[PDB]
Design a protein around this ligand. Structure first.
Ligand SMILES: Nc1ncnc2c1ncn2[C@@H]1O[C@H](COP(=O)(O)OP(=O)(O)O)[C@@H](O)[C@H]1O
Ligand SMILES: [Ca+2]
Ligand SMILES: [Ca+2]
Ligand SMILES: [Mg+2]
Lengths: 358, 127
């Protein structure tokens, strides 16, 4: 039975092919005293926390191998020599990194077989589509990925570093504007929880801001800190994720989610754009804000030509859509000989990943 | 990404003009019995290949995957994946079509001798 490992910039999603959800989800972080995952955030005596996949591209292969060791032996508790392994990669993943992934799987873990899939492709499959534009907003990266008949359109792909991690920091800053100082690693995790639990997208930002000032009770929610004291969370609930649509709020020069989606569509052949507009698929944890689908529908309609049909698909399990797509793919009868075997790798070299995985 | 090599139904696909229909069943592509052509379980997902043989020997391919309103996510996901794989197998020359229950294209409906029919139920999820 295959293992499915989605190598997220912020969270590893891992489990068993044929399950409908990943059973082991943990942070893709290293703590240098090495600690991996949750242990890395709970130890006080930590020089630095390291993100080896900070913006979706692996930068430290030794640290990545430690994360995979922790995945197999501490989390899934399996022997990698007994299982084919499906790994995920970002769109536009550099060729040498695809080769290094393959080399580590075969030479360090002795897996019998492996495969590498693009995250956005897997999310599109999980939604039951072969054509669409995937907007995958994760922790350290947001990808905008047009796909036609099963293949990404590389000239039209966009990547920005703006995603959930930036929004956690922005929420911290907004609270600082009120005298709270969430600074420590533990406090930052509390702010991340506040963000996930209480934020929402404003369909009409100017009117939601007016309500928060003049009718604060209709916006305000209390949040229970781990010591039981309550903090009031008001306009922060919608000001924080508004940065996804207006990134100058966090000092960034990249365009908002909708603008980047539009520009990607505009890089595609005019004769498939209608299909892309009717198949905007949200994936990743930072697309989980309430009302984001309706907001994006309104923005995309206003950017598109008269009478263009717009549809934003916001699947309820989309924090795990990449992984779920991989679980489906690697379960199929036809996938049985699509794996790269150890013997093929010894026969052809790491170059095999480019000829077998696309 | 490469084309499927051995699966017996892919070996059968698109060899001559005709209409070939498969149902997703527990992560596999299973042929639909001839007598059931055009009767779709709304609990399931299907893949359809229309091969048209122009009178000059050339084959034109349209791949349609049909999603019943009660099909499970493994089934709809597998239907899309199988569609891409069949296109790959036909060297990318198939035009793909997503067909949702009650919103099917008139081309897809037109394949069937007396139109599409629907029935409740289907094969259980692979999940
Ligand atoms: N319900 C939520 N609302 C808003 N953000 C969320 C929610 N759940 C998770 N996130 C955020 O999504 C990010 C994790 O998403 P994920 O898709 O797993 O990223 P990656 O694949 O890049 O590791 C985090 O920044 C997290 O705070
Ligand atoms: Ca079914
Ligand atoms: Ca094609
Ligand atoms: Mg991700």
């Amino acid at each position: 039975i295959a293992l499915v490992v989605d190598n997220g910039s912020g969270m590893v999603k891992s489990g068993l092919a044929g399950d409908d959800a990943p059973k082991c989800v943990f942070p893709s972080i290293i703590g240098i005293p090495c600690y991996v995952g949750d242990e890395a955030q709970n130890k006080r005596g930590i020089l630095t926390l390291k993100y080896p996949i900070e913006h979706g591209i692996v930068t430290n292969w030794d640290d990545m191998e430690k994360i995979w060791r922790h995945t197999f032996f501490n989390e899934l508790r399996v022997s990698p020599e007994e299982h084919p392994v499906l790994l995920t990669e970002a769109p536009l993943n550099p060729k040498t990194n695809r080769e290094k992934m393959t080399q580590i799987m075969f030479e360090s873990f002795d897996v019998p077989a492996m495969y590498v899939s693009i995250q956005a492709i897997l999310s599109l499959y999980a939604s039951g589509r072969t054509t669409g534009i995937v907007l995958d907003s994760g922790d350290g990266v947001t990808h905008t990925v047009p796909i036609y008949e099963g293949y990404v359109l590389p000239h039209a792909i966009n990547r920005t570093d703006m995603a959930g991690r930036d929004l956690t920091y922005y929420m911290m800053k907004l609270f600082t504007e009120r005298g709270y100082t969430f600074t420590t690693t533990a406090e930052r995790e509390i702010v991340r929880d506040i963000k996930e639990k209480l934020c929402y997208i404003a369909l009409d930002y100017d009117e939601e801001l007016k309500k928060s000032e003049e009718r604060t009770e209709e916006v305000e929610e209390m949040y229970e800190l781990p010591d039981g004291n309550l903090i009031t969370v008001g306009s922060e609930r919608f000001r924080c994720p508004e940065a996804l649509f207006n990134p100058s709020l966090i000092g960034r020069e990249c365009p908002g989610l909708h603008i980047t989606a539009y520009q990607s569509i505009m890089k595609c052949d005019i004769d498939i754009r209608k299909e892309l507009y009717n198949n905007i698929v949200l994936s990743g944890g930072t697309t989980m804000y309430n009302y984001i689908g309706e907001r994006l529908t309104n923005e995309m309609t206003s950017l598109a030509p008269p009478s263009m049909k717009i549809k934003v698909i916001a699947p309820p399990e989309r924090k795990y859509s990449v992984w779920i797509g991989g679980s489906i793919l690697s379960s199929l009868s036809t996938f049985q000989k699509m794996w790269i075997t150890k013997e093929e790798y010894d026969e052809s070299g790491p170059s095999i990943v480019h000829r077998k995985c696309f | 990404g490469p084309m499927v090599v051995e699966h017996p139904e892919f070996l059968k696909a698109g060899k001559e003009p005709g209409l070939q229909i498969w149902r997703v069943e527990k992560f596999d592509l299973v042929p639909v019995p001839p007598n059931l052509y055009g009767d779709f379980f709304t609990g399931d997902a299907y893949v359809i290949l229309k091969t048209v043989q122009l009178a000059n020997g050339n084959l034109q391919y349209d791949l349609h995957y049909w999603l019943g309103n009660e099909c499970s996510q493994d089934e709809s996901g597998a239907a899309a994946i199988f569609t891409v794989q069949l296109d790959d197998y036909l060297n990318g020359r198939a035009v793909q079509h997503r067909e949702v229950q009650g919103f099917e294209s008139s081309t897809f409906s037109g394949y069937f001798k007396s139109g599409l029919k629907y029935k409740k139920g289907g094969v259980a999820s692979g999940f």
